[PDB]
Amino acid sequence: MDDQGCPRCKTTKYRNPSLKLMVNVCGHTLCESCVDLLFVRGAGNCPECGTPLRKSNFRVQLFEDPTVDKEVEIRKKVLKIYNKREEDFPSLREYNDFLEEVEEIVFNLTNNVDLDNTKKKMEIYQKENKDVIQKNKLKLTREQEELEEALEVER
Amino acid sequence: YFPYDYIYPEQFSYMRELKRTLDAKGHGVLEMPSGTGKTVSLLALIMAYQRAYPLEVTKLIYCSRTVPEIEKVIEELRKLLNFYEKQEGEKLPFLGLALSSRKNLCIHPEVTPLRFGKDVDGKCHSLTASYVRAQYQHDTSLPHCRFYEEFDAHGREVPLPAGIYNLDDLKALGRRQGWCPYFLARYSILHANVVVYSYHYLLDPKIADLVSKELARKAVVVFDEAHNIDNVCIDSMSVNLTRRTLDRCQGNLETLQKTVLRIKETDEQRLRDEYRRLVEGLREASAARETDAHLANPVLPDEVLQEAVPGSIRTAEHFLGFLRRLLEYVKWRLRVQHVVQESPPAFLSGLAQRVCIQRKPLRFCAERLRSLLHTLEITDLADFSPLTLLANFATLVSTYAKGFTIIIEPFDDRTPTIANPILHFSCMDASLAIKPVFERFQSVIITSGTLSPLDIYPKILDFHPVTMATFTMTLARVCLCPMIIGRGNDQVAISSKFETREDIAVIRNYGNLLLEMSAVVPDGIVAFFTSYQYMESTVASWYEQGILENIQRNKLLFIETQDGAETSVALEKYQEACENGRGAILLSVARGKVSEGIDFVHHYGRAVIMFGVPYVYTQSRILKARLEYLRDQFQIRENDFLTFDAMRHAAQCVGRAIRGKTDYGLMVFADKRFARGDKRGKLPRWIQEHLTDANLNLTVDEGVQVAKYFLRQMAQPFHREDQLGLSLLSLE
Numbered sequence: 078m079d080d081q082g083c084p085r086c087k088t089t090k091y092r093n094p095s096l097k098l099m100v101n102v103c104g105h106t107l108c109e110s111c112v113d114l115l116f117v118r119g120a121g122n123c124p125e126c127g128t129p130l131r132k133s134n135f136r137v138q139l140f141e142d143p144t145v146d147k148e149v150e151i152r153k154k155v156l157k158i159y160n161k162r163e164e165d166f167p168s169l170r171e172y173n174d175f176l177e178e179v180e181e182i183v184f185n186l187t188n189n190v191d192l193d194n195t196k197k198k199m200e201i202y203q204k205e206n207k208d209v210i211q212k213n214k215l216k217l218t219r220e221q222e223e224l225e226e227a228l229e230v231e232r
Numbered sequence: 233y234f235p236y237d238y239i240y241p242e243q244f245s246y247m248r249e250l251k252r253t254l255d256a257k258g259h260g261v262l263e264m265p266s267g268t269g270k271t272v273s274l275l276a277l278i279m280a281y282q283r284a285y286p287l288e289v290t291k292l293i294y295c296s297r298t299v300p301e302i303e304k305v306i307e308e309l310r311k312l313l314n315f316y317e318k319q320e321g322e323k324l325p326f327l328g329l330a331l332s333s334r335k336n337l338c339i340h341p342e343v344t345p346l347r348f349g350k351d352v353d354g355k356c357h358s359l360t361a362s363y364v365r366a367q368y369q370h371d372t373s374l375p376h377c378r379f380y381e382e383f384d385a386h387g388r389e390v391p392l393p394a395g396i397y398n399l400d401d402l403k404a405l406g407r408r409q410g411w412c413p414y415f416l417a418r419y420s421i422l423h424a425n426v427v428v429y430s431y432h433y434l435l436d437p438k439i440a441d442l443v444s445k446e447l448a449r450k451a452v453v454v455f456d457e458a459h460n461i462d463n464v465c466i467d468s469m470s471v472n473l474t475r476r477t478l479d480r481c482q483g484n485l486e487t488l489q490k491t492v493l494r495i496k497e498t499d500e501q502r503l504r505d506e507y508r509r510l511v512e513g514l515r516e517a518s519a520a521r522e523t524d525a526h527l528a529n530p531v532l533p534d535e536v537l538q539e540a541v542p543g544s545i546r547t548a549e550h551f552l553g554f555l556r557r558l559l560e561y562v563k564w565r566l567r568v569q570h571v572v573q574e575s576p577p578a579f580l581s582g583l584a585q586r587v588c589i590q591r592k593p594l595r596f597c598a599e600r601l602r603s604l605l606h607t608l609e610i611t612d613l614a615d616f617s618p619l620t621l622l623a624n625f626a627t628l629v630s631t632y633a634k635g636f637t638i639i640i641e642p643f644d645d646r647t648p649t650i651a652n653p654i655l656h657f658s659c660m661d662a663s664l665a666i667k668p669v670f671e672r673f674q675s676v677i678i679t680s681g682t683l684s685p686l687d688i689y690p691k692i693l694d695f696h697p698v699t700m701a702t703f704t705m706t707l708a709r710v711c712l713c714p715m716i717i718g719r720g721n722d723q724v725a726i727s728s729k730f731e732t733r734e735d736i737a738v739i740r741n742y743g744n745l746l747l748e749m750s751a752v753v754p755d756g757i758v759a760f761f762t763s764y765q766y767m768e769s770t771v772a773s774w775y776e777q778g779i780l781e782n783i784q785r786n787k788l789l790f791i792e793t794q795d796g797a798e799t800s801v802a803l804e805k806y807q808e809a810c811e812n813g814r815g816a817i818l819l820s821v822a823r824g825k826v827s828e829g830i831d832f833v834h835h836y837g838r839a840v841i842m843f844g845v846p847y848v849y850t851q852s853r854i855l856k857a858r859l860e861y862l863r864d865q866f867q868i869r870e871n872d873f874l875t876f877d878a879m880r881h882a883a884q885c886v887g888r889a890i891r892g893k894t895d896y897g898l899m900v901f902a903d904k905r906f907a908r909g910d911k912r913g914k915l916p917r918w919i920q921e922h923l924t925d926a927n928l929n930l931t932v933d934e935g936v937q938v939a940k941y942f943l944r945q946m947a948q949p950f951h952r953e954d955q956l957g958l959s960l961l962s963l964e
């Protein structure tokens with residue numbers, strides 16, 4: 078808890094056990110005390126480098142979710158651009174051999190590997206694909222049809 | 233022919249039932265009460281079959297439910313082997329394998345006398361196939377497990393052992409020339425004409441190996457005391473987790489991190505060399521003995537568990553994948569234990585959204601966790617046992633959460649308080665643990681005496697064309713004497729299904745009748761109550777009025793405790809007082825620990841007292857989910873299921889004081905609820921031979937006079953009575 082450090086106030090974790098902690102996008106953990114203390118002094122800048130914080134991209138929580146910094150970054154990188162790859166690959170693969178590369182590339186991405194610039198070129202490659210969201214719309218339509226069919230049986 | 237016990241007749245009825253099973257080829261149900269020789273007459277017909285030269289493939293695996301009864305089955309099967317071994321002249325060989333694992337294991341004095349079974353067998357296997365497989369030979373580390381190496385020698389060789397052995401026969405042979413129960417057990421499973429063990433090994437979709445070949449329509453399985461199968465098929469595959477076990481699972485996980493961290497580059501390359509062999513290979517040599525210890529086949533009603541170790545590409549990469557299964561589980565478990573919640577899709581869909589992985593690595597993570605330490609193997613099961621409970625819980629989710637449910641009872645609800653939270657994850661349809669058993673073998677025959685209401689039997693949803701009861705023709709009916717006391721038109725207060733200490737009329741009636749029976753029963757009295765709550769309120773109420781104090785004058789008091797350590801020492805003091813001095817009295821619970829299988833007879837306890845209907849607490853949410861799912865299959869049977877479970881435990885506490893015929897036991901059902909229900913889901917041989925006479929609407933005063941008939945007429949059968957057959961089946 079107190080071993081990860083604290084940006085500005087530095088004196089907050091020792092005052093309240095049930096503290097509301099928040100996260101950002103670059104990969105840091107700032108409590109609710111550092112949110113208001115930094116806004117009245119500056120804005121939304123990273124205490125280590127330079128990450129702008131304009132929109133309300135903070136996830137408020139009081140259950141102390143970011144326990145280990147290594148396991149919280151791999152959960153955000155997959156549900157961003159790697160979650161959409163769960164549909165394109167099965168349309169061309171044929172055996173469980175390429176799925177090990179997805180699980181491996183996300184393990185080394187946290188341990189500082191130069192291969193981070195390689196995956197950024199694929200995101201800018203094609204500009205017309207969409208999908209993903211179109212697949213979630215069909216599941217919601219079929220769910221409403223089942224609820225309407227179950228309501229007719231009760232009637 | 234097996235000359236031993238007198239002819240009723242009884243083997244003529246059991247002979248016809250064993251002929252229709254091979255023709256119909258299906259599951260059969262046979263009623264065998266404790267008042268009829270279900271061991272001498274059964275084993276006399278079974279060896280006639282073992283000699284079936286015609287019947288190409290013929291097996292028997294026979295089970296039982298307790299470690300003494302195993303030995304009982306053994307000895308009885310010994311003698312019927314004896315006599316028509318003598319009679320038929322030239323003897324053909326035999327084997328009956330009592331296969332007792334853990335508690336009957338080790339001959340090394342360093343290992344043996346530590347009390348529990350599992351942990352000490354972990355020390356044994358850590359020594360054998362974890363230190364002496366890794367440190368493959370040395371001088372101190374590779375411990376003197378010398379007769380495993382003697383098994384190596386005679387497993388290269390071919391001996392032929394003699395016959396069916398006791399449990400202690402194999403330890404005495406351990407000393408002489410019999411080797412390890414496990415490994416000789418393996419070599420003797422290679423060919424065994426009869427293996428006797430507990431049915432809990434087969435009815436458990438986890439470490440069950442089925443101990444059979446690839447044939448799915450052969451062999452013969454015979455169960456024993458399989459009346460209480462509705463809970464075994466559910467409690468076996470049931471898994472749970474507490475905060476104490478979760479705290480130890482996280483503490484021992486940090487030790488594994490320091491093991492891989494201190495590995496340089498030379499030793500690290502050797503770990504990745506075995507990863508390629510496990511993928512291209514599928515018949516690893518480590519699948520011969522370590523599979524039985526760890527989670528063998530959790531998907532028993534499907535196929536075997538053998539994949540290409542998914543979810544792992546490196547050694548350190550698998551640690552982070554397993555660490556996310558522990559850091560996220562503790563965040564999802566503590567947040568749902570704040571309030572009550574019961575929703576199967578809440579834990580299945582909630583875990584997939586948080587942990588963004590697939591259902592393939594989470595399904596095989598239990599087998600990969602065991603194979604991870606096999607490469608280093610410098611560890612032992614003592615540090616791996618807390619990690620197994622977490623991997624076992626995750627296995628029941630990726631392929632079993634689509635038909636189960638989650639019961640959350642955190643704030644005072646038949647569970648410990650906030651100091652030790654616990655979650656529940658059991659089954660409903662008790663058929664997943666018995667369907668692979670019926671499919672792997674040909675025909676399975678269950679033998680239960682207390683299982684008489686067959687109308688509720690299709691609860692398992694399995695066919696049973698072989699249906700037959702048992703009456704046992706007996707001349708003198710002085711064998712048993714069922715009595716029902718329910719006061720009637722005098723006080724009508726004798727039942728207490730939802731009352732604690734609000735009244736004193738029912739408690740006073742239980743003490744007045746028990747005080748009078750303690751002076752007329754010639755031996756011990758084995759009484760039973762409803763639950764632990766009503767039992768403590770009845771004994772505490774006798775201290776004020778002065779009822780329990782008078783009982784201490786005659787017989788000695790014995791009340792079942794809570795801890796398992798003080799329960800074993802309490803039963804030994806009861807058996808010593810009833811045999812040496814005056815027979816004492818037992819004041820326990822119908823579902824406690826002296827009701828599973830004590831086999832107490834005349835010199836231990838020949839009187840049975842039932843204080844009310846032994847019902848169950850249906851208000852709890854751990855049992856309501858098991859009954860709510862029944863409404864989807866049987867709507868009108870929502871109440872008959874509770875009557876079956878109440879009368880099954882009542883007959884189980886009765887069908888124990890008698891075993892042969894000359895035991896002469898007594899049972900009392902002191903409750904007014906036994907009015908019309910005594911002519912439906914009860915023993916068929918009790919209605920025509922006992923319950924026919926007017927003896928159901930009795931009271932405390934009338935119950936003593938009726939009890940005097942069984943205690944006085946019993947003095948007449950002394951020289952000779954029903955002696956028919958003359959050791960030749962009456963030429964029938």
Ligand code: SF4
Pocket residue numbers: 337338339340343356357360377380412413
């Ligand atoms: S193998 Fe046989 S001897 Fe060696 S530990 Fe297990 S029991 Fe003790």
Ligand SMILES: [Zn+2]
Pocket residue numbers: 083084085086087088089107108109110111
């Ligand atoms: Zn702060």
Ligand SMILES: [Zn+2]
Pocket residue numbers: 103123125126127128
């Ligand atoms: Zn930064």
